[PDB]
RNA sequence: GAGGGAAACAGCCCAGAUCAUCAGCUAAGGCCCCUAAGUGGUGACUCAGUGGGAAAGGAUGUGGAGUUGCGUAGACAACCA
RNA sequence: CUCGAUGUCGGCUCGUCGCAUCCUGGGGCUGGAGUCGGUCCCAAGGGUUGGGCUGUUCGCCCAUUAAAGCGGCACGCGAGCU
RNA sequence: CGCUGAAAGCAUCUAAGCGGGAAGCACGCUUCAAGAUAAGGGUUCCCACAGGAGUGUUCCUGGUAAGGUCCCCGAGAGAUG
């Protein structure tokens, strides 16, 4: 239903500038590289309309034959990471398509996308926040203990959603509104203005901010 | 309570001719 | 029904088309369009008039054929002759303007005056800055415009400051006695 | 409006009516509107 | 010994029945008849020897009273506040399929041969079906005198 | 003290299991589907999902039957003095 | 029902539900001029502070806050703690 | 809170019909999701092998294609998977 514009990038790490009022601002830096179009979908094919892009550096050997072939229709080199925008204009795109860092400007509002850092098996004190009990005052062997996870005979269960003890991290985060601070479209940088989910090295998906700023 | 009241409904039903034990 | 079973006068070239269940009527003014219930005959009472017919002496065929009767009335006088329900605005600072034929603007002590469309149907006719009415070639949807009209601001009751009928009987209070 | 499961004419003008299911009481003075529940 | 179905013995057949302005309820109650053969000789409530039953028109089935807003239909998640509640008249607007699964379910033996035998039952909403290869034959909802 | 009905359900209803039966008629209770048998026939009423919980009390809901006041010497509502 | 054991007051921890709503949202009536209120109708989405005294719950008090809600869940919660 | 409006010559937000109206309801925002066995969809890839018993050709073994896994170097992942 939305128009969508949208680049694939890798995070490169973070840095800082002062703007032009002489403010620090922390800046991600997105290697927000070529992107071809690779797949158009359409709702006459396949129900809906979109735009498979491929990013990435990719070792010939390391792609299949069923890959080569997707890429070969496409008529495009093989990409590493193939990634679909949902856009109302998906349309407008042609296979092989070149996509830069310059589909964004100097002002622009983005979402970023991106599978955050993990954390293995945190604990319910570091994954949901949870207070423990006291370090002293007669404590005994459950300084960082979940407390009670239900009540009594009603019910005789515990509540699904219950906030446990889990895996945590390594999960798809989008962070909102952020306002794009420079695109050098030439070497395909991408200077944004905070913080973007995942490690240095990661694939990141920028796109129009869905709810334009705040 | 829901529960007697309930209880001593259950004797209006066809099969039980106007009584029920307990009521 | 004595209105249902009065026929309607049909006025000077004004084109009437019965058809079947549709009902046509064509004028110097404007088109309309209903299509006339199922359980009620229309005949054209030897092309010159209108007859309205209930099958049955049961309360929902009289309900039905009164409303047809003076709904088909309703709409030929209307392609020939138009409509109006006034209001008019009381207290101070308060007044009414026109941005065209089918607008108007209003400073009813907000912070910023309020705009005000209508269908195509409807039409305004704001006279003085403290009176205007609503015309159309409808009755229910000039109704509800002036009823939304006066809604704006409708009438405190400590003052009588607000949009209200032409006539209205603001039923009003006598506050810091 | 006095919502109580017991309404009744207080002007003579009060107007019982029964509205969407409810039985309310309409005068012209609105101390006088009640309704049913 | 009384006669006992073989597995593939019954042939099943495909219905399709026009659901419009057809009850709910009637429209249920004989397509889970049809479903699981009760109409048929050679009942066996252990061998499934049902037909295939169409409903076309599903979301211009007929209700009366209130119940397009008034009948409500809820569905539960397991957890806590995970109550949902839609209606009837909602149902066969947006998913009718759904809501003549249900009625229909709810009027079957509640068993494994009744998951299996449900899965027989196509609704479609608008007038049209993709069963054209498997040859409906139309169905008339009737009453047989005294 | 089993069987059938009452959703389940010692004490309620029907009914007292000698065994077998892939015969029939019934009781209480039922006959749209779950669930065996009527989406039974005819005539009324209800529109509250009442049926499928509840009080004092409130109410132009609706259908029916009486008693009584006014009334084409023109009654009640509306419109003119 | 449980005495061939159904551990109990308060707190901590973790919640979840109801609405008989404390705040925020919508409204009718006012003995509603305005700013503020009173009252009863909707409404459970989110929220609903930190301390002094006392084992307490409760309560009084201090400084705040939009507000410092009332209840159920074995007077929730000791094979979770004290 | 109304508009039109009868039953009930008036009146009436309602009976036919039409409309405004809340942090509530369902969406809008984020995330998971075809074991959704109803196991979905698009694109791309490999393709008619060998031998037995056969019994509508069935079916069972064997070597492979595309593709993977074991193994090794690691981390942006991780209790182990
Ligand atoms: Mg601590
Ligand atoms: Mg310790
Ligand atoms: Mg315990
Ligand atoms: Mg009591
Ligand atoms: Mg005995
Ligand atoms: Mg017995
Ligand atoms: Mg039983
Ligand atoms: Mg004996
Ligand atoms: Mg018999
Ligand atoms: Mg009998
Ligand atoms: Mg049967
Ligand atoms: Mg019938
Ligand atoms: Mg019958
Ligand atoms: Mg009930
Ligand atoms: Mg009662
Ligand atoms: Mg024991
Ligand atoms: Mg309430
Ligand atoms: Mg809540
Ligand atoms: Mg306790
Ligand atoms: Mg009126
Ligand atoms: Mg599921």
């Not at chain 5, 397991?78 to 995970?82: F, H, L």
């Given at each position: 239903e939305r128009t969508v514009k949208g680049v694939l990038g890798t995070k490169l790490g973070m840095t800082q500038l002062w703007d032009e009022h002489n403010r620090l601002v922390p800046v991600t830096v997105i290697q927000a590289g070529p992107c071809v179009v690779t797949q158009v979908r359409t709702p006459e094919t396949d129900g809906y309309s979109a735009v498979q892009l491929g990013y990435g550096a990719v070792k010939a050997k390391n792609v299949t034959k069923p890959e080569a072939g997707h890429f070969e229709k496409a008529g495009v080199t093989p990409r590493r990471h193939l990634v679909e925008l949902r856009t109302a204009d998906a349309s407008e795109y042609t296979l092989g398509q070149e996509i830069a860092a310059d589909v964004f400007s100097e002002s622009d509002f983005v979402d970023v996308t991106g599978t955050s850092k993990g954390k293995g098996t945190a604990g319910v004190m570091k994954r949901h926040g949870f207070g423990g009990l006291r370090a002293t005052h007669g404590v005994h062997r459950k300084h960082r203990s979940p407390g009670s996870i239900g009540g009594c005979s009603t019910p005789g269960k515990v509540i699904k959603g219950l906030r446990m003890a889990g895996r945590m991290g390594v999960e798809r985060v989008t962070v909102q509104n952020l306002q794009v601070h420079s695109v050098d479209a030439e070497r395909g940088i991408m200077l944004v203005r905070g913080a973007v989910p995942g490690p240095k090295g990661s694939l990141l998906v920028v796109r129009s901010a869905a709810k334009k700023a705040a | 309570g829901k529960t007697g009241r309930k209880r001593r409904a259950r004797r209006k039903k066809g099969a039980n001719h106007g009584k029920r034990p307990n009521a | 029904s004595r209105i249902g079973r009065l026929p309607i006068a049909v006025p000077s070239g004004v084109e009437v088309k019965l058809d079947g269940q549709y009902v046509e009527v064509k004028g110097p003014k404007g088109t309309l369009n209903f299509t006339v219930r199922e359980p009620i005959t229309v005949s054209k009472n030897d092309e010159g008039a209108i007859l309205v017919e209930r099958?049955?002496?049961?309360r929902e065929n009289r309900s039905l054929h009164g409303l047809t009767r003076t709904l088909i009335n309703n709409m030929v006088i209307g392609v020939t002759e138009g409509y109006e329900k006034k209001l008019e605005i009381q207290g101070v600072g308060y007044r009414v303007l026109s941005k065209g034929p089918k607008q108007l603007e209003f400073?009813?002590?907000?912070?910023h005056p309020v705009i005000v469309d209508a269908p195509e149907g409807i039409t305004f006719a704001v006279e003085n800055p403290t009176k205007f009415s609503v015309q159309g070639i409808d009755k229910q949807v000039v109704g509800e415009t002036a009823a939304n009209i006066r809604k704006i601001r409708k009438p405190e009751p400590y003052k009588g400051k607000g949009v209200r009928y032409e006539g209205e009987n603001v039923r009003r209070k006598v506050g810091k006695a | 409006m006095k919502v109580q499961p017991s309404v009744k004419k207080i002007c003579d003008k009060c107007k019982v009516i029964r509205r969407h299911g409810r039985v309310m009481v309409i005068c012209d003075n609105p101390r006088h509107k009640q309704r049913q529940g | 010994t009384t006669y006992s179905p073989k597995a593939g013995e019954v042939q099943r057949k495909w219905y399709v029945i026009d659901?419009?302005?057809?009850?709910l309820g009637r429209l249920a109650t004989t397509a889970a008849n049809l479903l699981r053969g009760k109409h048929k000789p050679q009942y066996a409530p252990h061998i499934d020897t049902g037909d295939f039953v169409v409903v076309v028109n599903a979301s211009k089935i007929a209700l009366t009273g209130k119940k397009a807003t008034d009948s409500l239909r809820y569905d539960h998640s397991?957890?806590?506040?995970?109550l949902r509640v839609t209606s009837i008249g909602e149902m066969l607007a947006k998913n009718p399929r759904r809501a003549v699964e249900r009625a229909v379910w709810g009027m079957m033996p509640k068993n494994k041969l009744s998951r299996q035998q449900l899965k027989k039952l196509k609704v479609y909403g608008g007038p049209e079906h993709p069963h054209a290869a498997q040859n409906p034959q139309p169905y008339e909802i009737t009453q047989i005198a005294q």
């Open positions: - | - | 099958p049955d002496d049961e400073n009813l002590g907000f912070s | - | 659901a419009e302005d057809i009850v397991g957890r806590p506040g995970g």
